[PDB]
Write an enzyme that holds these catalytic residues in place. Structure first.
Site, PDB file in Angstrom:
ATOM      1  N   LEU A  56      12.826  -7.452   0.079  1.00 14.55           N
ATOM      2  CA  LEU A  56      14.056  -6.629  -0.572  1.00 14.55           C
ATOM      3  C   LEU A  56      13.916  -6.697  -2.210  1.00 14.55           C
ATOM      4  O   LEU A  56      14.981  -6.957  -2.950  1.00 14.55           O
ATOM      5  CB  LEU A  56      15.247  -7.432  -0.261  1.00 14.55           C
ATOM      6  CG  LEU A  56      15.653  -7.256   1.304  1.00 14.55           C
ATOM      7  CD1 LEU A  56      16.872  -7.753   1.518  1.00 14.55           C
ATOM      8  CD2 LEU A  56      15.431  -5.750   1.754  1.00 14.55           C
ATOM      9  N   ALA A  57      12.982  -6.399  -2.758  1.00 12.97           N
ATOM     10  CA  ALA A  57      12.634  -6.110  -4.048  1.00 12.97           C
ATOM     11  C   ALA A  57      12.881  -4.634  -4.368  1.00 12.97           C
ATOM     12  O   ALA A  57      13.575  -4.012  -3.574  1.00 12.97           O
ATOM     13  CB  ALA A  57      11.049  -6.532  -4.619  1.00 12.97           C
TER      14      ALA A  57
ATOM     15  N   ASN B  96      14.832 -10.938   3.534  1.00 13.89           N
ATOM     16  CA  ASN B  96      13.998 -11.435   2.468  1.00 13.89           C
ATOM     17  C   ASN B  96      13.792 -12.872   2.313  1.00 13.89           C
ATOM     18  O   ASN B  96      14.595 -13.578   2.801  1.00 13.89           O
ATOM     19  CB  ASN B  96      14.888 -11.025   1.129  1.00 13.89           C
ATOM     20  CG  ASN B  96      13.720 -10.791  -0.284  1.00 13.89           C
ATOM     21  OD1 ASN B  96      13.116  -9.893  -0.149  1.00 13.89           O
ATOM     22  ND2 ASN B  96      13.963 -11.953  -1.028  1.00 13.89           N
TER      23      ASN B  96
ATOM     24  N   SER C 250      13.741 -15.228  -0.227  1.00 14.79           N
ATOM     25  CA  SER C 250      14.718 -15.738  -0.600  1.00 14.79           C
ATOM     26  C   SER C 250      16.093 -15.146  -0.461  1.00 14.79           C
ATOM     27  O   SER C 250      16.251 -13.742  -0.629  1.00 14.79           O
ATOM     28  CB  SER C 250      14.641 -15.870  -2.260  1.00 14.79           C
ATOM     29  OG  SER C 250      13.323 -15.907  -2.476  1.00 14.79           O
TER      30      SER C 250
ATOM     31  N   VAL D 156       6.137  -6.653   1.317  1.00  9.62           N
ATOM     32  CA  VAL D 156       5.923  -7.924   0.590  1.00  9.62           C
ATOM     33  C   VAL D 156       4.862  -7.758  -0.339  1.00  9.62           C
ATOM     34  O   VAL D 156       3.993  -7.008  -0.472  1.00  9.62           O
ATOM     35  CB  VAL D 156       5.531  -8.985   1.856  1.00  9.62           C
ATOM     36  CG1 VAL D 156       4.924 -10.403   1.346  1.00  9.62           C
ATOM     37  CG2 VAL D 156       6.831  -9.308   2.564  1.00  9.62           C
ATOM     38  N   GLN D 157       4.763  -8.830  -1.274  1.00  9.67           N
ATOM     39  CA  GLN D 157       3.672  -8.935  -2.330  1.00  9.67           C
ATOM     40  C   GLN D 157       2.494  -9.035  -1.636  1.00  9.67           C
ATOM     41  O   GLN D 157       2.247  -9.472  -0.754  1.00  9.67           O
ATOM     42  CB  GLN D 157       3.996 -10.261  -3.233  1.00  9.67           C
ATOM     43  CG  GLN D 157       2.843 -10.909  -3.535  1.00  9.67           C
ATOM     44  CD  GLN D 157       2.846 -11.944  -4.502  1.00  9.67           C
ATOM     45  OE1 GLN D 157       3.137 -11.584  -5.609  1.00  9.67           O
ATOM     46  NE2 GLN D 157       3.009 -13.226  -4.128  1.00  9.67           N
TER      47      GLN D 157
ATOM     48  N   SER E  68       3.592   6.467  -2.494  1.00  6.48           N
ATOM     49  CA  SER E  68       3.403   6.768  -3.706  1.00  6.48           C
ATOM     50  C   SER E  68       4.692   7.485  -4.334  1.00  6.48           C
ATOM     51  O   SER E  68       5.470   8.049  -3.376  1.00  6.48           O
ATOM     52  CB  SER E  68       2.292   7.659  -3.930  1.00  6.48           C
ATOM     53  OG  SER E  68       2.301   7.961  -5.331  1.00  6.48           O
TER      54      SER E  68
ATOM     55  N   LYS F 197      -4.647   6.385  -0.199  1.00 12.32           N
ATOM     56  CA  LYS F 197      -3.853   5.691  -1.179  1.00 12.32           C
ATOM     57  C   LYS F 197      -4.432   5.240  -2.568  1.00 12.32           C
ATOM     58  O   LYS F 197      -4.355   5.180  -3.569  1.00 12.32           O
ATOM     59  CB  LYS F 197      -2.803   4.593  -0.694  1.00 12.32           C
ATOM     60  CG  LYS F 197      -1.738   4.234  -1.834  1.00 12.32           C
ATOM     61  CD  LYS F 197      -1.240   5.286  -2.620  1.00 12.32           C
ATOM     62  CE  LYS F 197      -0.002   4.934  -3.490  1.00 12.32           C
ATOM     63  NZ  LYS F 197      -0.412   3.667  -4.135  1.00 12.32           N
TER      64      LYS F 197
ATOM     65  N   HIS G 260      -6.097   8.135  -4.458  1.00 12.53           N
ATOM     66  CA  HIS G 260      -4.820   8.609  -5.011  1.00 12.53           C
ATOM     67  C   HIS G 260      -4.686   7.821  -6.541  1.00 12.53           C
ATOM     68  O   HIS G 260      -4.481   8.730  -7.405  1.00 12.53           O
ATOM     69  CB  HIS G 260      -3.688   8.381  -4.381  1.00 12.53           C
ATOM     70  CG  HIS G 260      -2.369   8.766  -5.012  1.00 12.53           C
ATOM     71  ND1 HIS G 260      -1.824   7.784  -5.994  1.00 12.53           N
ATOM     72  CD2 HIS G 260      -1.499   9.940  -5.098  1.00 12.53           C
ATOM     73  CE1 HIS G 260      -0.890   8.291  -6.254  1.00 12.53           C
ATOM     74  NE2 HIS G 260      -0.721   9.548  -5.969  1.00 12.53           N
ATOM     75  N   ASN G 261      -4.830   6.466  -6.567  1.00 12.42           N
ATOM     76  CA  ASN G 261      -4.817   5.842  -7.551  1.00 12.42           C
ATOM     77  C   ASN G 261      -5.760   5.931  -8.662  1.00 12.42           C
ATOM     78  O   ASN G 261      -5.623   6.350  -9.567  1.00 12.42           O
ATOM     79  CB  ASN G 261      -4.644   4.069  -7.317  1.00 12.42           C
ATOM     80  CG  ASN G 261      -3.061   4.184  -6.710  1.00 12.42           C
ATOM     81  OD1 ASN G 261      -2.307   4.943  -6.958  1.00 12.42           O
ATOM     82  ND2 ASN G 261      -3.006   2.902  -6.177  1.00 12.42           N
TER      83      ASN G 261
ATOM     84  N   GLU H  23      -5.388   9.278 -10.017  1.00 15.56           N
ATOM     85  CA  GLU H  23      -4.454   9.023 -10.947  1.00 15.56           C
ATOM     86  C   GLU H  23      -4.923   8.400 -12.369  1.00 15.56           C
ATOM     87  O   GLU H  23      -4.549   8.943 -13.602  1.00 15.56           O
ATOM     88  CB  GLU H  23      -3.203   8.171 -10.488  1.00 15.56           C
ATOM     89  CG  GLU H  23      -2.195   7.700 -11.399  1.00 15.56           C
ATOM     90  CD  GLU H  23      -1.466   6.430 -11.189  1.00 15.56           C
ATOM     91  OE1 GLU H  23      -0.754   6.942 -10.088  1.00 15.56           O
ATOM     92  OE2 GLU H  23      -1.296   5.638 -11.780  1.00 15.56           O
TER      93      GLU H  23
END
Ligand SMILES: NC(=O)c1ccc[n+]([C@@H]2O[C@H](COP(=O)([O-])OP(=O)(O)OC[C@H]3O[C@@H](n4cnc5c(N)ncnc54)[C@H](OP(=O)(O)O)[C@@H]3O)[C@@H](O)[C@H]2O)c1
Ligand SMILES: NC(=O)c1ccc[n+]([C@@H]2O[C@H](COP(=O)([O-])OP(=O)(O)OC[C@H]3O[C@@H](n4cnc5c(N)ncnc54)[C@H](OP(=O)(O)O)[C@@H]3O)[C@@H](O)[C@H]2O)c1
Lengths: 466, 466
Positions: free
Chosen positions: A10-11, A32, A34, A73-74, A127, A182, A185-186, A189
């Site tokens: 939930l960032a 989340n 936390s 998630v990270q 993206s 993806k 894509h970066n 970019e």
């Protein structure tokens, strides 16, 4: 009593996607690690069909089956730890969707491991930034084709919509195909931003243009074939002033970083034997910008020519536009050739036209340009290089004169143009029937007895050169 | 009865190294998987202290302790399979030396695993070809320092001797440092050959020079500061004629291939965050040469300028010479920056001056140039970049104008010069106090909220740009 889909993480990215899903009429469970972020989201979701959970078991038990779980998630170890905590709770047939900026080889490993436990895993590239996640991102899901069809309607509803009504999502391919494109894509970019940066360097160091005229120039280019989100926001960036009413962009430290993920596109291209010169020069240009202390010291020791221009400025400004357009064409030709080779090696059966179509909106590299790439692959699916398509071929045949003069003028005036230079060198190498590689083969046979082939006759030959 | 050192792998490299060791007065045991190569060496080793063995048991039993074993086996799984078969037969303290062209990460893995079995393992780069292996190669041993000192006298005896009498071998560093240095050597070699190829391309396609004048040009260049083995053999190559007295090099198929290991240098630089633009463009140039059929078809569809030169061809030839010398300086400056970074990340404590010292002879890139790199570090061990050395700085600050003329002329006439181009772009980027990466930082903050730093103030900032 039961929700249709769940979101873990939930960032800013995960919460916006949960709001995006809920805005389409779906009920969403959220969780989340936390509980601080979960309690905040309920504060901002009154009247919305968001169900907060405060344990992985309550989260899993609140979802309809087959369970559809979105992982935001990270990236890295944190994603694997969340997966390994979900597996004992999931049932056969459940669908895990990882939407982070993940290395595609981790997605291949997780897909292969979770498949042994009858768990579906979708590695989905996302993206669009935080605003794209809320209103409509470009989505690149890869994994089990059966699992994608169970969540296809959801992804279709939240994805960005092009001008022709098509949503910017499609099934990319098996396992890691989604996170792979993806990654490309970066990389693409990186090149676009570097090519824009070189255009700005020529405008400032060579033409002596102010920030107001640089902004107007990019706005003018954005009205033509060069229209893109990156060109558009560059026009806005050069209009933003600070507290003392001066251009803020000119006060920003020019250090782009050495730990970006664009390098992984170049590393993969090197592994596949694909000449990805323009993106790789853009990656290396970011490395050069990070040794700012060394560059300042080197500036006091290594002199160079004084940049000056005594021609028609707005005519040279048009050559820079043409150089910018042709260079992006060369850059995309390289990136799409890399994806063709990656698809063959991994047996992904990538449809590169369909990929260009879902990049028309939502993503950072969105550009009217991408419509022509789709048409290139639609009028010739067996296309080996975008430079051979009649539209791009006719552009580069004409625009090469502008690109050659821009590169030559930059080199003569000490303005680094790594993207422009590698583009014209790639064009001149790709179109060369005979390259000086024959001498390299002779040297390798000289000192290493590596043998060589001949255009004359057939077979393999070895020579005593003395 | 017992021998002083053993050699496994009796192909051309292992056989000549065994003969090299024997010629210095050492007793040698030899072994090869296929006994026919062993039997053929018995025939060619009459009167030499070469003891043939036909099993790993007999081989190990014929060596004095601590056993010194040189592995010249095919790189990859063939080396691990031979090591795994040797492990039970060895005793604590024995020394295995892998002299193949091994990925340095394999050496790190093997060194860590064998150290658990009290077995020393030296990964040693070997350069010089067949003639070098027999008469004097450049040796780059890395591993246990104590183990190196036990075989140092043997390596010193067989290594090439520089003009001052010093052997071209020294302890590089722990675990895989030796094989890592060998990899960088090969990357530098790629760039040297590509820069020579581009000089040849300019002489033939732009100046219209015949093979006899091309050969004479390289021989004249070898008589100066460009003195190098690669330039010397290039002059001999253009002298080699076929039956019809035509230059044989012109009939050689111009496909360098993708099977080389130069790509590993570029991949490592990308992981380290090092701007290895020149070597990497040379690696990519080999990739483009490999797609010959595609290039032949592209030459019929993609047109470019017709090359022509009307100026003084003798003066332009001198500019090609200066551009070639400065491009080598830029290429070596990048490669030695890479080794410095790898030393820091791997805790190898590399002494770059010692590396230039042992490359003065034996190896493929050997040149008078390497004595100047040695002088640069001996005058200033804390030298941060070769471009800052007084000698090299004096060269590039003058030769840059020749390099600019060569790149600009090549670009305007459609001759690809990827090595020359990235050289001048590296010089202009490394010396630029202000690069256009500030716009890249502003863009990343626009669409991604990645924050940025400022030149005037201090701290981290974030801006709403519209
Ligand atoms: C412009 O990107 P990020 O922000 O660093 O991380 C986003 C999400 O990953 C979670 N996360 C981070 N590290 C984790 C770990 N070690 N284990 C499990 N979850 C983790 C965070 O939960 P938290 O909210 O607990 O950080 C957050 O929900
Ligand atoms: O160049 P290069 O060194 O690769 O030349 P190479 O001739 O392919 O290899 C040289 C040495 O490696 C050995 N070798 C090759 N493949 C092997 C395998 N699968 N297992 C064990 N030994 C192997 C060869 O033994 P053989 O002479 O038996 O091939 C030879 O002694």
């Amino acid at each position: 009593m039961t929700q249709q889909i769940g979101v873990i993480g939930l960032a800013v990215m995960g919460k916006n996607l949960a709001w995006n899903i809920e805005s389409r009429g779906y009920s969403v469970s959220v969780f989340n690690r936390s509980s601080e972020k979960t309690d905040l989201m309920v504060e901002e979701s009154k009247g919305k069909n968001i169900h907060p959970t405060y344990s992985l078991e309550e989260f899993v038990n609140s979802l309809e089956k087959p369970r559809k779980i979105l992982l935001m998630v990270q990236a890295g170890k944190a994603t694997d730890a969340t997966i390994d905590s979900l597996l004992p709770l999931l049932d056969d047939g459940d669908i895990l969707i990882d939407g982070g900026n993940t290395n595609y080889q981790d997605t291949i490993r997780r897909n292969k491991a979770l498949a042994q436990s009858a768990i579906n895993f979708i590695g989905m590239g996302v993206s669009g930034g935080e605003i794209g996640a809320l209103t409509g991102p470009s989505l690149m899901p890869g994994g089990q084709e059966e699992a994608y069809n169970k969540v296809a309607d959801i992804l279709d509803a939240i994805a960005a919509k092009a001008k022709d009504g098509a949503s910017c999502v499609t099934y990319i391919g098996p396992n890691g195909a989604g996170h792979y494109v993806k990654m490309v894509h970066n990389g693409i970019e990186y090149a676009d931003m570097q090519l824009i940066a070189e255009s700005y360097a020529m405008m400032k160091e060579l033409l002596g243009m102010s920030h107001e005229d640089i902004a107007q120039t990019f706005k003018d280019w954005n009205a033509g074939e060069l229209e893109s989100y990156l060109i558009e926001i560059t026009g806005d960036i050069f209009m933003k002033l600070d507290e003392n009413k001066e251009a803020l962009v000119e006060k920003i430290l020019d250090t782009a970083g050495q730990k970006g993920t664009g390098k992984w596109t170049s590393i993969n291209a090197l592994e596949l034997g694909i000449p990805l010169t323009i993106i790789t020069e853009s990656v290396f240009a970011r490395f050069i910008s990070s040794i700012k202390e060394e560059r300042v010291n080197a500036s006091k020791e290594l002199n160079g020519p004084k940049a000056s221009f005594d021609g028609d400025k707005k005519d040279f400004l048009e050559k820079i536009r043409k150089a910018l357009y042709m260079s992006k064409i060369c850059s995309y030709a390289q990136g799409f050739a890399q994806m063709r080779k990656a698809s063959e090696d991994n047996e992904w059966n990538l449809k590169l036209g369909d990929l260009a179509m879902i990049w028309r909106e939502g993503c950072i590299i969105r550009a009217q340009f991408l419509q022509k790439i789709k048409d290139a692959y639609d009028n010739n699916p067996g296309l080996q290089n975008l430079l051979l398509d009649p539209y791009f071929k006719n552009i580069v045949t004409e625009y090469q004169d502008a690109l050659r003069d821009v590169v030559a003028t930059g080199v003569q005036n000490g303005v680094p143009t790594p993207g422009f230079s590698s583009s014209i060198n790639y064009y001149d190498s790709y179109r060369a029937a005979d390259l000086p590689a024959n001498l390299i083969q002779a040297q390798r046979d000289y000192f290493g007895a590596h043998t060589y082939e001949r255009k004359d006759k057939e077979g393999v030959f070895h020579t005593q050169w003395i």
